[PDB]
Design a protein around this ligand. Structure first.
Ligand SMILES: NS(=O)(=O)c1ccc(Nc2nc(OCC3CCCCC3)c3nc[nH]c3n2)cc1
Lengths: 255, 298
Protein backbone atom coordinates (compact mmCIF):
# COMPACT_ATOMS: atom_id res chain seq x y z
CA UNK A 1 0.00 0.00 0.00
CA UNK A 2 3.09 2.16 -0.34
CA UNK A 3 2.48 0.96 -3.94
CA UNK A 4 -1.27 0.25 -4.28
CA UNK A 5 -1.85 3.43 -6.39
CA UNK A 6 1.40 3.08 -8.43
CA UNK A 7 0.41 -0.50 -9.20
CA UNK A 8 -3.19 0.38 -10.12
CA UNK A 9 -1.99 3.24 -12.40
CA UNK A 10 0.51 0.88 -14.02
CA UNK A 11 -2.10 -1.85 -14.53
CA UNK A 12 -4.44 0.70 -16.03
CA UNK A 13 -1.70 1.58 -18.60
CA UNK A 14 -0.80 -2.09 -19.31
CA UNK A 15 -4.42 -3.27 -19.86
CA UNK A 16 -4.72 -0.91 -22.84
CA UNK A 17 -1.54 -2.36 -24.44
CA UNK A 18 -2.49 -5.95 -23.49
CA UNK A 19 -5.99 -5.61 -24.93
CA UNK A 20 -7.13 -8.17 -27.51
CA UNK A 21 -8.48 -6.93 -30.85
CA UNK A 22 -12.24 -6.37 -30.35
CA UNK A 23 -13.43 -7.60 -33.71
CA UNK A 24 -11.07 -10.55 -34.35
CA UNK A 25 -13.74 -13.29 -34.73
CA UNK A 26 -15.20 -11.81 -37.98
CA UNK A 27 -11.68 -12.21 -39.39
CA UNK A 28 -11.47 -15.89 -38.34
CA UNK A 29 -12.58 -18.09 -41.28
CA UNK A 30 -13.25 -21.30 -39.37
CA UNK A 31 -13.95 -20.47 -35.70
CA UNK A 32 -16.79 -18.64 -33.95
CA UNK A 33 -17.55 -16.98 -30.58
CA UNK A 34 -19.56 -20.09 -29.76
CA UNK A 35 -16.51 -22.32 -30.36
CA UNK A 36 -14.45 -19.95 -28.14
CA UNK A 37 -17.15 -20.22 -25.40
CA UNK A 38 -16.79 -24.03 -25.49
CA UNK A 39 -12.99 -23.78 -25.20
CA UNK A 40 -13.12 -21.28 -22.33
CA UNK A 41 -15.66 -23.45 -20.44
CA UNK A 42 -13.35 -26.44 -20.86
CA UNK A 43 -10.46 -24.34 -19.41
CA UNK A 44 -12.66 -23.52 -16.41
CA UNK A 45 -12.97 -27.34 -16.01
CA UNK A 46 -9.20 -27.88 -16.35
CA UNK A 47 -8.72 -25.10 -13.77
CA UNK A 48 -10.99 -27.04 -11.37
CA UNK A 49 -9.51 -30.45 -12.06
CA UNK A 50 -6.02 -29.15 -11.27
CA UNK A 51 -7.04 -26.61 -8.53
CA UNK A 52 -5.41 -23.81 -10.49
CA UNK A 53 -5.73 -20.17 -9.43
CA UNK A 54 -8.55 -18.16 -10.96
CA UNK A 55 -5.84 -15.75 -12.10
CA UNK A 56 -4.23 -18.48 -14.25
CA UNK A 57 -7.61 -18.97 -16.04
CA UNK A 58 -7.94 -15.20 -16.67
CA UNK A 59 -4.38 -15.05 -18.04
CA UNK A 60 -4.81 -18.08 -20.28
CA UNK A 61 -7.92 -16.42 -21.81
CA UNK A 62 -5.99 -13.20 -22.43
CA UNK A 63 -3.24 -15.23 -24.22
CA UNK A 64 -5.79 -16.97 -26.42
CA UNK A 65 -7.59 -13.78 -27.40
CA UNK A 66 -4.35 -11.98 -28.27
CA UNK A 67 -3.10 -15.05 -30.17
CA UNK A 68 -6.36 -15.25 -32.19
CA UNK A 69 -6.17 -11.49 -32.80
CA UNK A 70 -3.35 -12.13 -35.28
CA UNK A 71 -3.31 -15.87 -36.01
CA UNK A 72 -5.89 -17.73 -38.08
CA UNK A 73 -6.73 -21.08 -36.53
CA UNK A 74 -8.76 -24.06 -37.76
CA UNK A 75 -11.41 -25.49 -35.41
CA UNK A 76 -9.46 -28.74 -34.95
CA UNK A 77 -6.43 -26.79 -33.58
CA UNK A 78 -8.29 -24.38 -31.30
CA UNK A 79 -7.95 -26.71 -28.25
CA UNK A 80 -4.16 -26.90 -28.90
CA UNK A 81 -3.97 -23.12 -28.66
CA UNK A 82 -5.98 -23.22 -25.40
CA UNK A 83 -3.81 -25.97 -23.90
CA UNK A 84 -0.50 -24.21 -24.64
CA UNK A 85 -2.00 -20.99 -23.31
CA UNK A 86 -3.09 -22.67 -20.06
CA UNK A 87 0.34 -24.32 -19.77
CA UNK A 88 1.97 -20.89 -20.22
CA UNK A 89 -0.38 -19.25 -17.75
CA UNK A 90 0.33 -21.97 -15.17
CA UNK A 91 4.15 -21.69 -15.47
CA UNK A 92 3.86 -17.89 -15.06
CA UNK A 93 1.30 -17.88 -12.21
CA UNK A 94 1.30 -21.21 -10.30
CA UNK A 95 3.59 -22.31 -7.53
CA UNK A 96 3.10 -25.89 -8.71
CA UNK A 97 2.03 -25.89 -12.36
CA UNK A 98 0.81 -29.22 -13.85
CA UNK A 99 3.49 -30.95 -15.99
CA UNK A 100 3.29 -30.99 -19.81
CA UNK A 101 2.24 -34.68 -19.52
CA UNK A 102 -0.84 -33.66 -17.51
CA UNK A 103 -1.88 -31.14 -20.21
CA UNK A 104 -1.36 -33.74 -22.98
CA UNK A 105 -3.58 -36.14 -20.99
CA UNK A 106 -6.37 -33.60 -20.41
CA UNK A 107 -6.68 -32.92 -24.17
CA UNK A 108 -6.25 -35.30 -29.10
CA UNK A 109 -2.65 -33.97 -29.54
CA UNK A 110 0.94 -35.03 -28.83
CA UNK A 111 3.49 -33.66 -26.29
CA UNK A 112 5.51 -32.47 -29.30
CA UNK A 113 2.53 -30.52 -30.66
CA UNK A 114 1.77 -28.89 -27.31
CA UNK A 115 5.38 -27.82 -26.85
CA UNK A 116 5.73 -26.41 -30.38
CA UNK A 117 2.46 -24.51 -29.89
CA UNK A 118 3.85 -23.22 -26.58
CA UNK A 119 6.88 -21.82 -28.48
CA UNK A 120 4.50 -20.46 -31.15
CA UNK A 121 2.26 -18.71 -28.61
CA UNK A 122 5.37 -17.11 -26.95
CA UNK A 123 6.64 -15.88 -30.32
CA UNK A 124 3.30 -14.37 -31.33
CA UNK A 125 2.80 -12.72 -27.91
CA UNK A 126 6.55 -11.79 -28.00
CA UNK A 127 6.86 -13.19 -24.46
CA UNK A 128 4.59 -10.41 -23.11
CA UNK A 129 2.66 -12.53 -20.57
CA UNK A 130 2.32 -10.28 -17.43
CA UNK A 131 -1.11 -9.01 -18.50
CA UNK A 132 -3.75 -7.31 -16.26
CA UNK A 133 -6.89 -9.36 -15.63
CA UNK A 134 -10.38 -8.76 -14.26
CA UNK A 135 -9.13 -10.73 -11.26
CA UNK A 136 -6.21 -8.32 -10.53
CA UNK A 137 -8.60 -5.33 -10.52
CA UNK A 138 -11.22 -7.11 -8.36
CA UNK A 139 -8.82 -7.92 -5.54
CA UNK A 140 -7.84 -4.20 -5.35
CA UNK A 141 -11.51 -3.11 -5.46
CA UNK A 142 -12.28 -5.63 -2.65
CA UNK A 143 -10.11 -3.43 -0.37
CA UNK A 144 -12.86 -0.77 -0.49
CA UNK A 145 -15.54 -2.82 1.25
CA UNK A 146 -16.86 -1.73 4.63
CA UNK A 147 -16.92 -4.23 6.05
CA UNK A 148 -15.35 -7.01 3.92
CA UNK A 149 -17.90 -9.51 2.61
CA UNK A 150 -17.03 -13.01 1.34
CA UNK A 151 -20.27 -13.38 -0.59
CA UNK A 152 -19.62 -10.04 -2.36
CA UNK A 153 -16.08 -11.16 -3.27
CA UNK A 154 -17.01 -14.68 -4.54
CA UNK A 155 -19.98 -13.31 -6.50
CA UNK A 156 -17.80 -10.60 -8.08
CA UNK A 157 -15.35 -13.30 -9.17
CA UNK A 158 -18.20 -15.44 -10.48
CA UNK A 159 -19.56 -12.55 -12.62
CA UNK A 160 -16.07 -11.51 -13.86
CA UNK A 161 -15.46 -15.16 -14.84
CA UNK A 162 -18.75 -15.46 -16.81
CA UNK A 163 -17.61 -12.44 -18.84
CA UNK A 164 -14.64 -14.60 -20.02
CA UNK A 165 -17.04 -17.00 -21.82
CA UNK A 166 -18.77 -14.52 -24.15
CA UNK A 167 -16.48 -12.63 -26.60
CA UNK A 168 -19.54 -10.69 -27.77
CA UNK A 169 -20.00 -8.46 -25.87
CA UNK A 170 -17.09 -8.64 -23.39
CA UNK A 171 -14.09 -8.23 -25.76
CA UNK A 172 -15.00 -4.57 -26.03
CA UNK A 173 -14.64 -3.86 -22.30
CA UNK A 174 -11.39 -3.36 -20.44
CA UNK A 175 -10.63 -5.67 -17.46
CA UNK A 176 -10.86 -2.72 -15.03
CA UNK A 177 -14.33 -1.91 -16.38
CA UNK A 178 -15.59 -5.50 -16.19
CA UNK A 179 -14.23 -5.67 -12.68
CA UNK A 180 -16.05 -2.38 -11.86
CA UNK A 181 -19.38 -3.75 -13.17
CA UNK A 182 -18.86 -7.15 -11.46
CA UNK A 183 -18.02 -5.50 -8.17
CA UNK A 184 -21.03 -3.16 -8.17
CA UNK A 185 -23.37 -5.93 -9.32
CA UNK A 186 -22.23 -8.32 -6.54
CA UNK A 187 -22.33 -5.62 -3.85
CA UNK A 188 -25.84 -4.70 -4.92
CA UNK A 189 -27.09 -8.31 -5.19
CA UNK A 190 -25.73 -9.21 -1.76
CA UNK A 191 -26.11 -6.04 0.40
CA UNK A 192 -28.07 -3.47 -1.64
CA UNK A 193 -24.98 -1.18 -1.65
CA UNK A 194 -23.49 0.63 -4.67
CA UNK A 195 -20.13 1.31 -6.26
CA UNK A 196 -18.45 3.27 -3.46
CA UNK A 197 -17.26 6.88 -3.58
CA UNK A 198 -13.69 5.84 -2.72
CA UNK A 199 -13.60 3.71 -5.90
CA UNK A 200 -14.70 6.73 -7.94
CA UNK A 201 -11.67 8.58 -6.51
CA UNK A 202 -9.41 5.57 -7.25
CA UNK A 203 -10.58 4.61 -10.74
CA UNK A 204 -12.37 7.64 -12.19
CA UNK A 205 -15.33 5.36 -12.97
CA UNK A 206 -18.87 6.16 -11.95
CA UNK A 207 -22.09 4.13 -12.29
CA UNK A 208 -22.68 6.19 -15.47
CA UNK A 209 -19.39 5.10 -17.11
CA UNK A 210 -19.84 1.47 -15.96
CA UNK A 211 -23.49 1.40 -17.12
CA UNK A 212 -23.08 -0.18 -20.57
CA UNK A 213 -20.94 -3.04 -19.12
CA UNK A 214 -23.29 -3.40 -16.12
CA UNK A 215 -26.35 -3.71 -18.45
CA UNK A 216 -24.52 -6.46 -20.35
CA UNK A 217 -23.32 -8.19 -17.15
CA UNK A 218 -26.77 -7.99 -15.55
CA UNK A 219 -28.28 -9.74 -18.60
CA UNK A 220 -25.54 -12.38 -18.56
CA UNK A 221 -26.24 -12.95 -14.83
CA UNK A 222 -30.05 -13.30 -15.36
CA UNK A 223 -29.70 -15.68 -18.31
CA UNK A 224 -26.87 -17.67 -16.70
CA UNK A 225 -28.87 -20.84 -15.75
CA UNK A 226 -29.82 -21.09 -19.46
CA UNK A 227 -26.39 -20.62 -21.11
CA UNK A 228 -25.06 -23.61 -23.12
CA UNK A 229 -21.87 -23.39 -21.01
CA UNK A 230 -22.32 -24.19 -17.31
CA UNK A 231 -18.88 -24.98 -15.77
CA UNK A 232 -18.60 -21.58 -13.99
CA UNK A 233 -22.05 -22.00 -12.42
CA UNK A 234 -21.11 -25.52 -11.19
CA UNK A 235 -17.69 -24.37 -9.99
CA UNK A 236 -19.24 -21.52 -7.98
CA UNK A 237 -21.67 -23.86 -6.16
CA UNK A 238 -18.70 -25.02 -4.10
CA UNK A 239 -18.29 -23.88 -0.49
CA UNK A 240 -14.84 -22.57 -1.49
CA UNK A 241 -16.70 -19.79 -3.35
CA UNK A 242 -19.50 -19.57 -0.74
CA UNK A 243 -22.05 -21.16 -3.08
CA UNK A 244 -22.60 -17.77 -4.75
CA UNK A 245 -23.99 -19.13 -8.02
CA UNK A 246 -27.07 -20.27 -6.01
CA UNK A 247 -27.89 -16.64 -5.15
CA UNK A 248 -30.70 -14.95 -7.05
CA UNK A 249 -29.80 -12.13 -9.41
CA UNK A 250 -31.72 -8.86 -8.89
CA UNK A 251 -34.57 -8.26 -11.38
CA UNK A 252 -33.55 -4.61 -11.92
CA UNK A 253 -30.51 -2.41 -11.22
CA UNK A 254 -32.21 0.99 -11.11
CA UNK A 255 -29.27 3.04 -12.42
CA UNK B 1 20.78 -15.63 -35.21
CA UNK B 2 23.82 -15.85 -32.97
CA UNK B 3 26.01 -15.14 -36.06
CA UNK B 4 26.73 -11.53 -35.01
CA UNK B 5 28.00 -12.50 -31.54
CA UNK B 6 31.49 -13.60 -30.67
CA UNK B 7 31.71 -15.46 -27.37
CA UNK B 8 34.53 -14.17 -25.17
CA UNK B 9 34.28 -16.22 -21.97
CA UNK B 10 31.96 -17.73 -19.38
CA UNK B 11 30.85 -15.43 -16.58
CA UNK B 12 28.82 -17.88 -14.45
CA UNK B 13 25.61 -19.77 -13.66
CA UNK B 14 22.82 -18.18 -11.71
CA UNK B 15 19.30 -19.43 -10.96
CA UNK B 16 19.01 -21.09 -14.38
CA UNK B 17 20.96 -21.27 -17.67
CA UNK B 18 24.58 -20.09 -18.21
CA UNK B 19 25.87 -16.53 -18.73
CA UNK B 20 28.66 -15.67 -21.17
CA UNK B 21 30.37 -12.42 -22.04
CA UNK B 22 30.18 -11.82 -25.80
CA UNK B 23 30.60 -9.01 -28.31
CA UNK B 24 28.42 -7.79 -31.11
CA UNK B 25 30.75 -7.92 -34.13
CA UNK B 26 28.75 -5.25 -35.99
CA UNK B 27 28.31 -2.55 -33.32
CA UNK B 28 31.19 -3.40 -30.95
CA UNK B 29 28.73 -3.71 -28.05
CA UNK B 30 29.84 -6.08 -25.29
CA UNK B 31 26.85 -8.13 -24.09
CA UNK B 32 25.96 -10.81 -21.51
CA UNK B 33 24.36 -13.88 -23.15
CA UNK B 34 22.16 -16.07 -20.97
CA UNK B 35 22.02 -19.45 -22.67
CA UNK B 36 18.98 -21.64 -21.92
CA UNK B 37 18.78 -25.19 -23.23
CA UNK B 38 15.29 -26.38 -24.12
CA UNK B 39 14.39 -29.68 -25.84
CA UNK B 40 10.81 -30.91 -26.12
CA UNK B 41 10.13 -34.41 -24.69
CA UNK B 42 10.53 -32.66 -21.31
CA UNK B 43 8.93 -29.53 -19.79
CA UNK B 44 9.22 -26.88 -22.54
CA UNK B 45 10.26 -23.31 -21.78
CA UNK B 46 11.03 -22.95 -18.03
CA UNK B 47 8.75 -20.79 -15.86
CA UNK B 48 11.87 -18.88 -14.71
CA UNK B 49 12.53 -17.82 -18.38
CA UNK B 50 8.87 -16.94 -18.95
CA UNK B 51 8.80 -14.75 -15.86
CA UNK B 52 12.23 -13.20 -16.28
CA UNK B 53 11.76 -12.26 -19.94
CA UNK B 54 8.23 -10.89 -19.63
CA UNK B 55 9.10 -8.87 -16.51
CA UNK B 56 12.46 -7.57 -17.82
CA UNK B 57 10.84 -6.27 -21.02
CA UNK B 58 8.71 -3.97 -18.74
CA UNK B 59 11.46 -2.97 -16.31
CA UNK B 60 13.56 -0.40 -18.11
CA UNK B 61 15.48 1.47 -15.45
CA UNK B 62 19.18 2.60 -15.06
CA UNK B 63 19.48 0.35 -11.96
CA UNK B 64 17.99 -2.71 -13.44
CA UNK B 65 19.92 -4.87 -15.80
CA UNK B 66 18.75 -4.25 -19.37
CA UNK B 67 17.33 -7.09 -21.53
CA UNK B 68 18.26 -6.27 -25.17
CA UNK B 69 16.85 -9.14 -27.19
CA UNK B 70 15.47 -12.66 -27.13
CA UNK B 71 16.88 -15.08 -29.69
CA UNK B 72 14.59 -18.07 -29.74
CA UNK B 73 15.38 -21.29 -31.58
CA UNK B 74 13.50 -24.66 -31.26
CA UNK B 75 16.51 -25.96 -29.20
CA UNK B 76 18.09 -22.94 -27.45
CA UNK B 77 16.94 -19.70 -25.86
CA UNK B 78 19.40 -16.77 -25.64
CA UNK B 79 18.65 -13.69 -23.57
CA UNK B 80 20.89 -10.80 -24.69
CA UNK B 81 21.65 -8.32 -21.87
CA UNK B 82 23.82 -5.23 -21.55
CA UNK B 83 27.15 -6.39 -20.07
CA UNK B 84 28.02 -4.93 -16.68
CA UNK B 85 31.63 -4.99 -15.40
CA UNK B 86 31.75 -6.78 -12.06
CA UNK B 87 29.54 -8.03 -9.27
CA UNK B 88 29.40 -6.44 -5.82
CA UNK B 89 30.77 -9.54 -4.07
CA UNK B 90 33.98 -9.60 -6.13
CA UNK B 91 34.32 -5.84 -5.53
CA UNK B 92 33.86 -6.20 -1.75
CA UNK B 93 36.52 -8.96 -1.72
CA UNK B 94 38.85 -6.65 -3.73
CA UNK B 95 38.25 -3.87 -1.15
CA UNK B 96 39.86 -6.21 1.43
CA UNK B 97 42.27 -3.70 2.94
CA UNK B 98 41.11 -0.27 1.74
CA UNK B 99 37.44 -0.53 2.74
CA UNK B 100 34.67 0.88 0.51
CA UNK B 101 34.38 4.67 0.73
CA UNK B 102 31.19 5.78 2.50
CA UNK B 103 30.17 7.99 -0.46
CA UNK B 104 30.24 4.84 -2.62
CA UNK B 105 28.32 2.69 -0.13
CA UNK B 106 25.73 5.49 0.07
CA UNK B 107 25.53 5.88 -3.73
CA UNK B 108 25.09 2.12 -4.18
CA UNK B 109 22.35 1.76 -1.56
CA UNK B 110 20.54 4.81 -3.03
CA UNK B 111 20.69 3.32 -6.54
CA UNK B 112 19.66 -0.13 -5.24
CA UNK B 113 16.63 1.42 -3.55
CA UNK B 114 15.76 3.20 -6.79
CA UNK B 115 15.86 -0.05 -8.86
CA UNK B 116 13.87 -1.83 -6.15
CA UNK B 117 11.18 0.90 -5.82
CA UNK B 118 10.75 0.75 -9.59
CA UNK B 119 10.33 -3.06 -9.40
CA UNK B 120 7.82 -2.88 -6.55
CA UNK B 121 5.92 -0.04 -8.34
CA UNK B 122 5.58 -2.37 -11.32
CA UNK B 123 4.30 -5.19 -9.08
CA UNK B 124 7.55 -7.23 -9.30
CA UNK B 125 9.25 -9.01 -6.39
CA UNK B 126 12.92 -9.83 -6.96
CA UNK B 127 13.26 -12.50 -4.24
CA UNK B 128 17.00 -13.10 -4.57
CA UNK B 129 18.96 -9.93 -3.67
CA UNK B 130 22.51 -10.79 -2.70
CA UNK B 131 25.87 -9.19 -3.73
CA UNK B 132 26.44 -11.79 -6.44
CA UNK B 133 23.23 -10.61 -8.19
CA UNK B 134 24.18 -6.92 -7.95
CA UNK B 135 26.34 -5.56 -10.74
CA UNK B 136 28.59 -2.55 -10.85
CA UNK B 137 30.14 -0.69 -13.77
CA UNK B 138 33.05 1.76 -14.22
CA UNK B 139 30.83 4.87 -14.20
CA UNK B 140 29.53 4.28 -10.62
CA UNK B 141 26.27 2.52 -11.50
CA UNK B 142 24.94 -0.57 -9.66
CA UNK B 143 22.13 -2.75 -11.14
CA UNK B 144 19.78 -5.55 -9.98
CA UNK B 145 20.50 -8.73 -11.96
CA UNK B 146 19.27 -12.38 -12.07
CA UNK B 147 15.52 -11.99 -12.17
CA UNK B 148 15.23 -15.80 -12.44
CA UNK B 149 13.38 -15.92 -9.07
CA UNK B 150 11.31 -12.78 -9.63
CA UNK B 151 7.56 -12.75 -9.92
CA UNK B 152 4.55 -10.46 -10.65
CA UNK B 153 2.39 -9.99 -7.58
CA UNK B 154 -1.13 -8.80 -6.84
CA UNK B 155 -2.64 -6.32 -4.42
CA UNK B 156 -3.17 -7.70 -1.93
CA UNK B 157 -0.69 -10.57 -2.22
CA UNK B 158 -1.60 -14.21 -2.04
CA UNK B 159 0.66 -17.11 -1.10
CA UNK B 160 3.73 -17.48 -3.33
CA UNK B 161 6.61 -19.94 -3.41
CA UNK B 162 8.06 -20.50 0.06
CA UNK B 163 11.56 -21.65 -0.94
CA UNK B 164 12.72 -18.19 -1.87
CA UNK B 165 15.76 -15.88 -1.17
CA UNK B 166 19.32 -17.16 -0.52
CA UNK B 167 19.41 -18.03 3.18
CA UNK B 168 21.75 -15.26 4.47
CA UNK B 169 19.46 -12.56 3.00
CA UNK B 170 16.13 -14.32 3.76
CA UNK B 171 13.53 -12.36 5.76
CA UNK B 172 12.27 -13.62 9.14
CA UNK B 173 8.67 -13.86 7.93
CA UNK B 174 9.80 -16.38 5.28
CA UNK B 175 11.86 -18.25 7.89
CA UNK B 176 8.85 -18.41 10.23
CA UNK B 177 6.54 -19.76 7.49
CA UNK B 178 4.16 -16.79 6.98
CA UNK B 179 1.64 -17.50 4.17
CA UNK B 180 1.82 -13.93 2.86
CA UNK B 181 5.09 -12.20 2.26
CA UNK B 182 5.46 -9.11 0.11
CA UNK B 183 7.75 -6.27 -0.97
CA UNK B 184 9.34 -6.17 2.51
CA UNK B 185 11.28 -9.35 1.79
CA UNK B 186 13.40 -7.48 -0.82
CA UNK B 187 14.03 -4.59 1.65
CA UNK B 188 15.29 -7.06 4.24
CA UNK B 189 17.87 -8.44 1.78
CA UNK B 190 18.96 -4.89 0.92
CA UNK B 191 19.35 -4.10 4.66
CA UNK B 192 21.54 -7.18 4.96
CA UNK B 193 23.60 -5.96 2.01
CA UNK B 194 23.94 -2.36 3.37
CA UNK B 195 25.43 -3.81 6.56
CA UNK B 196 27.63 -6.09 4.42
CA UNK B 197 28.93 -3.16 2.34
CA UNK B 198 30.10 -1.57 5.61
CA UNK B 199 31.68 -4.58 7.44
CA UNK B 200 32.41 -6.66 4.27
CA UNK B 201 31.12 -9.88 5.82
CA UNK B 202 27.55 -11.20 5.81
CA UNK B 203 25.46 -9.87 8.69
CA UNK B 204 23.73 -13.22 9.28
CA UNK B 205 25.79 -16.14 7.86
CA UNK B 206 23.57 -19.11 8.87
CA UNK B 207 23.91 -22.66 7.58
CA UNK B 208 20.32 -23.62 8.25
CA UNK B 209 16.93 -22.05 8.79
CA UNK B 210 16.99 -22.30 12.59
CA UNK B 211 20.68 -21.14 12.70
CA UNK B 212 19.68 -18.20 10.47
CA UNK B 213 16.71 -17.30 12.73
CA UNK B 214 18.84 -17.51 15.87
CA UNK B 215 21.56 -15.27 14.34
CA UNK B 216 18.86 -12.78 13.55
CA UNK B 217 17.39 -12.97 17.13
CA UNK B 218 20.80 -12.52 18.78
CA UNK B 219 21.37 -9.29 16.87
CA UNK B 220 17.93 -7.67 16.84
CA UNK B 221 16.44 -9.47 19.84
CA UNK B 222 13.90 -12.29 19.82
CA UNK B 223 10.60 -10.82 18.47
CA UNK B 224 7.57 -10.80 20.77
CA UNK B 225 3.93 -9.62 20.36
CA UNK B 226 4.97 -6.07 21.21
CA UNK B 227 7.60 -5.68 18.44
CA UNK B 228 5.77 -7.91 15.88
CA UNK B 229 2.04 -8.51 16.55
CA UNK B 230 1.18 -12.00 15.32
CA UNK B 231 4.73 -13.53 15.60
CA UNK B 232 3.74 -16.14 18.17
CA UNK B 233 0.98 -17.43 15.85
CA UNK B 234 3.31 -17.96 12.92
CA UNK B 235 3.57 -21.57 11.70
CA UNK B 236 7.26 -22.11 12.49
CA UNK B 237 7.38 -19.98 15.63
CA UNK B 238 8.22 -21.94 18.75
CA UNK B 239 7.61 -20.84 22.39
CA UNK B 240 10.86 -22.72 23.17
CA UNK B 241 12.89 -20.10 21.14
CA UNK B 242 15.63 -18.51 23.30
CA UNK B 243 14.67 -14.96 24.22
CA UNK B 244 17.68 -12.80 23.39
CA UNK B 245 17.82 -9.11 24.27
CA UNK B 246 18.14 -6.64 21.38
CA UNK B 247 21.62 -5.32 20.55
CA UNK B 248 22.36 -1.58 20.40
CA UNK B 249 22.75 -0.96 16.59
CA UNK B 250 25.89 1.03 17.13
CA UNK B 251 27.34 -2.42 17.88
CA UNK B 252 25.68 -4.14 14.90
CA UNK B 253 27.60 -2.08 12.30
CA UNK B 254 30.08 0.00 14.36
CA UNK B 255 31.44 2.30 11.52
CA UNK B 256 27.93 3.51 10.68
CA UNK B 257 26.87 6.86 12.06
CA UNK B 258 23.45 8.01 13.40
CA UNK B 259 21.59 8.43 10.07
CA UNK B 260 22.98 5.20 8.62
CA UNK B 261 21.98 3.25 11.74
CA UNK B 262 18.46 4.68 11.64
CA UNK B 263 18.01 3.64 8.01
CA UNK B 264 19.44 0.21 8.61
CA UNK B 265 17.10 -0.30 11.62
CA UNK B 266 14.02 0.56 9.52
CA UNK B 267 15.13 -1.90 6.81
CA UNK B 268 15.57 -4.65 9.43
CA UNK B 269 12.30 -4.10 11.28
CA UNK B 270 10.75 -7.47 12.23
CA UNK B 271 7.21 -6.49 11.29
CA UNK B 272 7.06 -6.40 7.47
CA UNK B 273 4.33 -3.69 7.69
CA UNK B 274 6.63 -1.43 9.72
CA UNK B 275 9.75 -2.15 7.61
CA UNK B 276 10.48 0.80 5.41
CA UNK B 277 9.51 0.68 1.69
CA UNK B 278 12.17 1.40 -0.97
CA UNK B 279 10.25 4.49 -2.01
CA UNK B 280 10.13 6.00 1.54
CA UNK B 281 13.85 5.09 2.08
CA UNK B 282 15.00 7.35 -0.80
CA UNK B 283 14.11 10.36 1.29
CA UNK B 284 15.96 9.15 4.39
CA UNK B 285 18.38 11.78 5.89
CA UNK B 286 21.16 9.21 5.30
CA UNK B 287 20.94 10.34 1.67
CA UNK B 288 20.95 14.16 2.02
CA UNK B 289 24.49 14.50 0.66
CA UNK B 290 24.43 11.52 -1.74
CA UNK B 291 26.60 11.68 -4.85
CA UNK B 292 27.58 9.15 -7.54
CA UNK B 293 31.33 8.68 -7.60
CA UNK B 294 32.98 6.24 -9.96
CA UNK B 295 34.19 3.17 -8.06
CA UNK B 296 37.62 3.73 -6.57
CA UNK B 297 39.12 0.50 -7.96
CA UNK B 298 40.06 -1.02 -11.30
N1 LIG C 1 32.19 -12.35 -11.28
S1 LIG C 1 32.55 -11.06 -11.99
O1 LIG C 1 32.74 -10.05 -10.93
O2 LIG C 1 33.82 -11.20 -12.73
C1 LIG C 1 31.43 -10.56 -13.06
C2 LIG C 1 30.06 -10.81 -12.87
C3 LIG C 1 29.11 -10.37 -13.79
C4 LIG C 1 29.48 -9.67 -14.94
N2 LIG C 1 28.59 -9.20 -15.87
C5 LIG C 1 27.26 -9.52 -16.03
N3 LIG C 1 26.77 -10.66 -15.48
C6 LIG C 1 25.48 -11.04 -15.60
O3 LIG C 1 25.05 -12.19 -15.03
C7 LIG C 1 26.01 -13.04 -14.43
C8 LIG C 1 25.32 -14.01 -13.51
C9 LIG C 1 26.41 -14.94 -12.95
C10 LIG C 1 25.88 -15.85 -11.83
C11 LIG C 1 25.12 -15.06 -10.77
C12 LIG C 1 24.00 -14.22 -11.42
C13 LIG C 1 24.60 -13.22 -12.40
C14 LIG C 1 24.57 -10.19 -16.36
N4 LIG C 1 23.26 -10.23 -16.69
C15 LIG C 1 23.00 -9.11 -17.42
N5 LIG C 1 24.15 -8.36 -17.55
C16 LIG C 1 25.13 -9.05 -16.90
N6 LIG C 1 26.43 -8.72 -16.75
C17 LIG C 1 30.85 -9.41 -15.13
C18 LIG C 1 31.81 -9.85 -14.21
Amino acid sequence: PDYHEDIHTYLREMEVKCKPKVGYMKKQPDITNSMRAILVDWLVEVGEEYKLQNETLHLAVNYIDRFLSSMSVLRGKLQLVGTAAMLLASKFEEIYPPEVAEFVYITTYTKKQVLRMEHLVLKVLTFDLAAPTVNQFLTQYFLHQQPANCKVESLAMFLGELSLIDADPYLKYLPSVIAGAAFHLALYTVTGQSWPESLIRKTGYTLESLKPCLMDLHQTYLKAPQHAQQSIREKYKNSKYHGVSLLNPPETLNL
Amino acid sequence: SMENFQKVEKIGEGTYGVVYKARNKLTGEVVALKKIRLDTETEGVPSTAIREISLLKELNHPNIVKLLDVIHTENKLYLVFEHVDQDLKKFMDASALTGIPLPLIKSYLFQLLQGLAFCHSHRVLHRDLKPQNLLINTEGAIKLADFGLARAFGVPVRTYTHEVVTLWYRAPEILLGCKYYSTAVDIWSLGCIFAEMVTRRALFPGDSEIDQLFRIFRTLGTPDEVVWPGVTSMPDYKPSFPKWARQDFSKVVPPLDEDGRSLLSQMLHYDPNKRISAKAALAHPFFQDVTKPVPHLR
